[PDB]
């Protein structure tokens, strides 16, 4: 169905109107990238103009394809120049931030797709720009695109390490491989690219698009492409790659995911909004006891936590990240993995049990890094849950929201040395004791080396979860029925505090600001 898409961004410029104070979480595709990445070149790719600024982006840009432009905050303006458009682009970043702004270019020669792109990340201002990211990617409906060069390493991206930070599994992470032309055998990049090495599950796509050099001298990106194509189709090993790269591709890949991810998605998001617009009535009604508002908002948000811990989700998530990640992490790890024949003899060297063991020690010590990684990737997982439960519910709530956010992220904090310690303590404990008695001479050795270490890799892949759940996701939930409300009634500072959540009373017409909206929105969906 092709009317989805044009009903997504109606959707858009209604709540950037709002201003996109969250409340809704609308399907959609948001780009993250390093600056060196060459993002905006991806970006004009898609188009076929050069409507990105060159040579400090700092609001999110919504971008919607159906040649000219218009702008939301100009309505109804058929900008007929793209140097114009790439001018107010510029102009609309100078004047000011979390506010959207929404440019729809028409073009016929891209196809029917939107996408958001984010300020850029660097190699406290970055990390304005990295908690910016995440207001856009802990969004359970928004799917991210991970924009990476194949210059550098993809392991250790930036883009691929925050893109974790909300999906450790990168389950509604899509990636983009930038500079083919420079990828050589020394990169990650090109294992991804075919496929034998996977971190994200919605795939990989490769493009060329223009450098600097070439954006230095007026390089069409019609000639651009018609380049990427010639040199995708002349490359000695990317001649059987060519079907499944490049722009044209890209294109045509991204509309088709966001077609279909907007159509599941919209019978919960009908229901979603009818509920926000039903409650958000009833606090426009009020505003025309502050103890027991206190106690039955916080008390709530508490068991909206536990319930989705418990297995949108959480428990199920928490669980595949330990049986489908940190298992597969681990049943990877092999055994003589780094150890060489000469090891084994160098060993020797300085009883054949006594070699063994200082072989199993070292052996042991390349578990510690997965097992760190297992409560990270929880975490991760624990703290976008509040993010989740912050757009189920109710747009109304003054800096008590952002309050609870803080307790609530603050208190995970709280719980990663503890979880660390203990893990660290369960991988020490093997390379402690080592024992033969549980239930060719380099030969034997490495017979050894890989009966015991087979049996410890089965007792750190159950055990590891097991502290994490004992230190962190059990401990989390108890706590977090007490430590909200303790804090959230102690300060001194309430009802003050509490109090300073009024807004004076004057607010609830704003709120309306937000009323106003769903009631429009509404009507987009009927």
């Avoid at 194949?150 to 691929?160: G, I, N, Q, V």
């Amino acid at each position: 169905m092709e009317r989805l898409i044009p009903i997504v961004n109606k959707l858009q410029d209604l709540f950037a109107e709002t201003g996109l104070d969250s409340p809704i979480d609308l399907p959609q595709i948001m780009v993250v990238g390093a600056q060196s990445s060459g993002k905006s070149s991806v970006l004009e790719n898609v188009v076929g103009e050069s409507i990105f600024p060159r040579g400090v982006t700092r609001r999110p840009i919504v971008v919607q394809l159906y040649a000219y432009a218009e702008f939301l905050h100009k309505p109804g303006v058929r900008f007929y120049n793209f140097d114009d458009v790439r001018a107010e682009i510029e102009r609309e970043t100078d004047r000011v931030s979390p506010k959207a702004i929404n440019l729809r270019v028409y073009s016929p020669h891209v196809v029917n797709l939107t996408v958001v792109d984010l300020p850029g990340l660097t190699k406290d201002i970055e990390r304005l720009i990295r908690a910016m990211v995440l207001s856009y990617i802990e969004r359970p409906n928004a799917i991210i695109l991970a924009v990476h060069p194949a210059t550098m390493d993809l392991a250790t991206s930036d883009a691929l390490q925050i893109a974790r930070q909300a999906d450790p599994e990168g389950r509604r992470t899509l990636g983009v491989i930038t500079k083919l032309d420079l990828m050589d055998k020394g990169t990650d990049a090109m294992e991804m690219l075919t496929g034998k090495v996977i971190p994200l599950k919605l795939g990989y796509i490769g493009v060329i698009c223009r450098g600097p050099a070439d954006l230095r001298a007026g390089k069409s990106i019609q000639q651009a492409r018609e380049d990427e194509i010639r040199f995708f189709r002349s490359h000695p090993v990317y001649r059987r790659l060519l079907p499944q790269l490049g722009t044209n591709t890209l294109a045509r890949t991204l509309s088709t995911l966001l077609m279909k991810h907007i159509r599941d998605t919209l019978p919960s998001i009908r229901q979603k909004m009818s509920q926000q617009l039903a409650e958000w009535r009833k606090e426009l009604q009020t505003l025309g006891d502050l103890g027991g508002a206190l106690l039955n908002v916080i008390n709530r948000y508490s068991s909206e936590f536990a319930k989705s811990l418990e297995g949108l989700y959480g428990g199920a998530r928490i669980n595949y990240i330990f049986n489908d990640i940190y298992a597969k992490e681990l049943q990877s790890m092999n055994a003589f993995e780094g150890l060489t024949r000469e090891d084994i003899r160098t060993a020797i060297r300085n009883v054949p049990e006594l070699a063994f063991e200082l072989l199993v020690k070292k052996q042991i010590t390349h578990f510690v890094p997965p097992a760190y990684s297992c409560v990270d990737l929880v975490y991760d997982e624990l703290v976008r849950l509040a993010l989740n439960c912050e757009t189920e519910l109710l747009q109304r709530y003054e800096n008590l929201r952002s309050e609870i956010l803080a307790c609530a992220q603050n208190l995970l904090r709280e719980l990663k040395q503890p979880c660390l310690e203990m893990v660290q303590n369960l991988i020490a404990m093997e390379t402690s004791y080592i024992s033969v008695n549980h239930k060719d001479d380099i030969e034997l050795i490495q017979t050894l080396l890989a009966s015991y270490f087979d049996v410890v890799r089965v007792n750190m892949m159950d055990m590891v979860p097991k502290a994490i759940m004992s230190f962190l996701v059990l401990r989390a939930r108890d706590r977090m029925q007490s430590r909200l409300v303790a804090d959230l009634y102690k300060p001194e500072r309430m009802s003050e505090l509490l109090n300073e959540s009024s807004d004076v009373a004057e607010r609830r017409a704003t709120a309306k600001r937000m009323v106003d909206l769903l009631q429009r929105g509404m009507a987009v969906i009927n």
